[PDB]
Amino acid sequence: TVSAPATYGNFVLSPENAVTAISYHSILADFNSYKAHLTSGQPHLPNDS
Amino acid sequence: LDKILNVEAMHTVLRALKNTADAMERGLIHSFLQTLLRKAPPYFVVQTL
Questions:
Q1: Measured between CA atoms, how close is B20 to chain A, in angstroms?
Q2: Which protein family is named in the record (chain A)?
């Protein structure tokens, strides 16, 4: 008996994503995690989008 | 992004309505000035009379 995910995982665009998609035709998934790790000086994200 | 497009559509309808209202005011001024200038004789005519 195996435990499997009951439903699909939902990906959502953030407001920062909306701005970059309107202006640059480009989306960086989970923008805020990158910006916080970038200004804090942390070289590694904990997880992938 | 869908919300952005809905609000953009409502705002473009608003802009069109406002521009048309101002155009109607300008057109009324233009037409009145036009008829007023139509019925006005020149200086030499009126001073002679």
A1: 29
A2: Belongs to the herpesviridae major capsid protein family.
- Give me the helices (H) in B1-49, please: 2-38, 43-48
To which H or E segment does residue A35 belong? helix A31-39
State whether residue B5 sits within 8 Å of chain A by CB.
no
Residue A12 CA to residue A18 CA, distance in Å, equals: 10
Interatomic CA distance for residues B39 and B6, integer angstroms: 50
Amino acid identity, position A43: P
Chain B residues in contact with A17 (beta carbon < 8 A): none
Give the pair of three-digit tokens for residue B10: 């409502």
Give the span between the Cα atoms of A49 and A35, in whole angstroms. 14
Angstrom resolution of this structure: 3.3
Q: Do the chains contact at A13 and B4, CB–CB below 8 Å? A: no
